[PDB]
Amino acid sequence: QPEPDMITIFIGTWNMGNAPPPKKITSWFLSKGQGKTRDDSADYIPHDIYVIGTQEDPLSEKEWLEILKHSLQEITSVTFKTVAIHTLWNIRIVVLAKPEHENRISHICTDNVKTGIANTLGNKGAVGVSFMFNGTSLGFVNSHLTSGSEKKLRRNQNYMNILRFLALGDKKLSPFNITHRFTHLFWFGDLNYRVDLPTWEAETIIQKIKQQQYADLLSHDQLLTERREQKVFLHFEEEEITFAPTYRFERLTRDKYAYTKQKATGMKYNLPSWCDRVLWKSYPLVHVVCQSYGSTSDIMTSDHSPVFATFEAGVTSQFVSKNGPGTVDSQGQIEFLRCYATLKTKSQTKFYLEFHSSCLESFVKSQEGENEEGSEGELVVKFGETLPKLKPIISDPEYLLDQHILISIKSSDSDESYGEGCIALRLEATETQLPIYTPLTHHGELTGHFQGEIKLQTSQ
Numbered sequence: 314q315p316e317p318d319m320i321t322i323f324i325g326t327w328n329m330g331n332a333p334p335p336k337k338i339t340s341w342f343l344s345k346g347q348g349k350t351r352d353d354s355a356d357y358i359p360h361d362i363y364v365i366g367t368q369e370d371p372l373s374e375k376e377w378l379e380i381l382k383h384s385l386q387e388i389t390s391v392t393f394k395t396v397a398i399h400t401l402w403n404i405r406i407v408v409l410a411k412p413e414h415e416n417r418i419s420h421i422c423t424d425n426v427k428t429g430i431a432n433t434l435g436n437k438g439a440v441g442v443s444f445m446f447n448g449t450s451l452g453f454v455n456s457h458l459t460s461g462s463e464k465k466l467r468r469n470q471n472y473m474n475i476l477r478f479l480a481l482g483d484k485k486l487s488p489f490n491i492t493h494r495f496t497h498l499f500w501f502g503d504l505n506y507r508v509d510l511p512t513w514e515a516e517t518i519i520q521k522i523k524q525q526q527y528a529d530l531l532s533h534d535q536l537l538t539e540r541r542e543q544k545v546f547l548h549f550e551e552e553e554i555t556f557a558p559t560y561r562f563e564r565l566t567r568d569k570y571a572y573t574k575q576k577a578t579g580m581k582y583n584l585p586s587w588c589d590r591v592l593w594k595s596y597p598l599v600h601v602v603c604q605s606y607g608s609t610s611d612i613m614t615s616d617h618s619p620v621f622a623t624f625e626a627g628v629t630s631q632f633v634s635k636n637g638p639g640t641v642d643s644q645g646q647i648e649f650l651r652c653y654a655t656l657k658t659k660s661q662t663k664f665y666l667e668f669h670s671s672c673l674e675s676f677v678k679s680q681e682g683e684n685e686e687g688s689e690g691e692l693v694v695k696f697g698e699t700l701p702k703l704k705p706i707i708s709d710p711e712y713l714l715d716q717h718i719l720i721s722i723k724s725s726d727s728d729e730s731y732g733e734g735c736i737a738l739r740l741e742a743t744e745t746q747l748p749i750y751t752p753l754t755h756h757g758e759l760t761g762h763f764q765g766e767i768k769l770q771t772s773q
């Protein structure tokens with residue numbers, strides 16, 4: 314029975330509005346409704362992994378697991394295994410997988426982050442799950458961010474707190490936040506970003522939605538505009554939105570958007586908005602293709618419609634050779650040539666690098682670089698040909714070319730990371746000097762760049 318090199322992943326996000334679901338929710342898991350929908354010919358084909366994020370979820374874990382499992386069994390005739398379930402207040406994540414995957418999944422982690430302080434602490438935040446699927450690390454984040462059209466900056470702050478403090482994946486990757494710990498990271502939820510148009514334009518917006526003309530609305534979506542301005546979700550992807558705004562509906566129909574200010578809304582307008590979103594970030598040159606992104610039309614218990622997204626995702630096998638794991642394979646090596654970091658910092662400490670990768674027995678510390686002044690004010694840290702030769706555990710190119718090197722640039726004075734990035738070993742050539750590049754981030758914000766050349770030796 315061969316190990317897969319692709320799997321499909323279903324991501325769902327639904328703010329349930331504190332109401333129990335209707336008796337049938339299969340359209341959600343089938344990616345049927347509005348937007349980029351799944352072909353009918355695939356309806357019986359199970360996804361490998363289903364990740365369900367809910368917000369304002371009024372059900373117990375037991376109650377929701379029974380609904381989800383019975384739903385998938387009705388669709389696929391497969392009894393899914395529960396990988397993980399984690400709940401913070403009324404924010405929940407469930408991960409289900411095909412039974413054939415049970416012995417491919419390991420290192421299961423869960424965590425949550427509570428956002429805000431005092432007033433603003435008590436219902437918003439995030440839950441997450443991570444695990445290994447054979448040689449591939451997968452992370453999943455369900456966040457319910459701050460509500461309200463005039464709180465986009467708070468949402469951005471909530472995002473930075475979640476990626477800083479959510480403790481998922483390999484704790485040995487100590488310089489790295491969740492935006493670097495996984496081969497594939499999916500971040501979804503009621504992100505609560507709104508269409509920023511005047512309140513007076515409510516009926517005009519509704520008209521546009523009825524005509525399926527979303528362009529003049531999406532050009533004012535706060536998540537797209539904040540992302541364009543590099544204020545949030547830097548280096549994440551989102552599929553194009555081709556479904557109607559998923560909030561705020563009158564319950565028990567989808568024929569009406571309920572946007573007017575009411576005591577129940579704190580006298581706030583809720584113009585139709587794409588609150589409910591799925592984004593992802595995968596390591597460079599790993600296969601990931603969105604195959605659906607849309608909303609259901611027939612699930613109407615909440616003032617939000619459920620959102621679905623599905624992905625093809627590249628996975629690798631748990632590789633064994635005669636040598637590694639448990640030793641190096643002297644036929645393998647990674648050399649960095651003519652490397653330099655460009656940093657936005659005003660600091661004047663010396664810096665060193667750390668190289669982290671599951672192709673190494675443990676992380677590798679470099680010597681300190683040579684600081685120079687850049688022509689436009691910047692710090693340039695030069696490593697020359699000084700960087701340590703990295704010794705991978707396995708030299709087979711079928712393994713090594715699929716790996717990645719995480720890089721942290723750390724202050725010698727404080728040992729704190731000033732920037733993190735990732736280099737793919739999926740090179741055009743081996744035994745050949747080739748350009749490499751990564752942006753560097755810290756707390757998910759841009760702090761610099763790392764560039765130079767690489768020379769990879771495999772056993773072939």
Ligand SMILES: O=C(c1c(F)cccc1F)N1CCCCCC1
Pocket residue numbers: 537538540541542548549550551
């Ligand atoms: O499509 C992108 C995009 C891009 F154009 C280049 C690189 C990475 C990206 F994610 N974004 C969505 C539209 C708004 C702009 C922000 C990001």
